[PDB]
C-alpha cells in the first residue's frame, strides 16, 4: 500500500 499513482 506504499507508493502512488506518480513516480
Amino acid at each position, epitope marked *: *500500500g*506504499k507508493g*502512488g499513482t*506518480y*513516480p
Partner: antibody
Amino acid sequence: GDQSLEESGGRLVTPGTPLTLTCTVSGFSLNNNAMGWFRQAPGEGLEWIGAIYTDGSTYYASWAKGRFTISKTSTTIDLKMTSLTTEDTATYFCARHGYTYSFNLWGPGTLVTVSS
Amino acid sequence: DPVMTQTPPSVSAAVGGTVTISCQSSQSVYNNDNLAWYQQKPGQPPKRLIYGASTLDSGVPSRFKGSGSGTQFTLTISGVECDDAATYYCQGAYNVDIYPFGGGTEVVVKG
C-alpha cells in the same frame, strides 16, 4: 491539473500540550497514494516522521513511535503529537509517496513552536 | 533502520562550475536504485530533483545528473547557476518501511 497539499494547525504550544496538524490534499486519491509527514527544525536538516499507506497502516521513525499518530479521511491526513518539548519546534511538511518510493508533492509547511 | 550519510556538509563553486555531492546508504536501497535527491531553499518546501537514482523530475534542468546504485550515489550540478544555491538532500527507500534522509549539503554559488 491541480494536485496540491496544504498543512494547517501550527501554533505556539507549551511543553506537554497536545497538538494535531492537518494536511489537506487536492487532485488525487488517498486510496491510491501513500503520504508522509516530515519536519525541519530551524537551521537543521529534513527528517521523516512517519507514513500512512493506502490501507491506513502507519510506520514511524524510531524516535516518533508512540508519541506521533497519523490517521486519514478521504481528503486529509493528520499528525497527532503528544509529549511535545522544545526539540519538536520545527516546520512540519506533508508529502505524497510516488511509486519510486520518494516524495513527489510537498505542502508549504506549518510551523510548530514549543515554548514557555 | 537504514541511515544515509551525505558529504560534504557544504561546498562553494563559481557560476558555470561543477558541484558534486555524495550519499552513502548503510544498506542496499530497494531495487538498488530507489534513491532520490531534493533541493530546498530557505522558507520553501523541498523539491524533488531526481528519483530512481538517475531520472530527472519534471521541471528540472538537464545540468542536474544523478548516478550510483546499491549504497553509493552522486548528484552533480554541471554549470552551477545562482538559482542552484540551496541545500540538497538524499533519501533512500528499502525493503523495510523507513524513509531516511541525508543530513544535507549547502551549496554556495560564487557570483
